[PDB]
Design a protein around this ligand. Sequence first.
Ligand SMILES: [Cd+2]
Ligand SMILES: [Cd+2]
Lengths: 36, 36
Amino acid sequence: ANEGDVYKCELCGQVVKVLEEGGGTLVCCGEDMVKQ
Amino acid sequence: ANEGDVYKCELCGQVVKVLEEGGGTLVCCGEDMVKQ
Ligand SMILES: [Cd+2]
Ligand SMILES: [Cd+2]
């Protein structure tokens, strides 16, 4: 997505800080993680 | 996953450092990201 970003799941509540962007999404709990 | 972990996609190559573990997975590119 964009280095130095954070993605939090709106289901479990998993938060991960992207340190290396790629070209996809973090579908967690069958739901595309949200950005913080 | 447990905090203090990293997840790299085997498609795009997106690396994200889990800040707050959770009961879910980071399905990216239709593939559950792998741990680093
Ligand atoms: Cd990906
Ligand atoms: Cd989740």
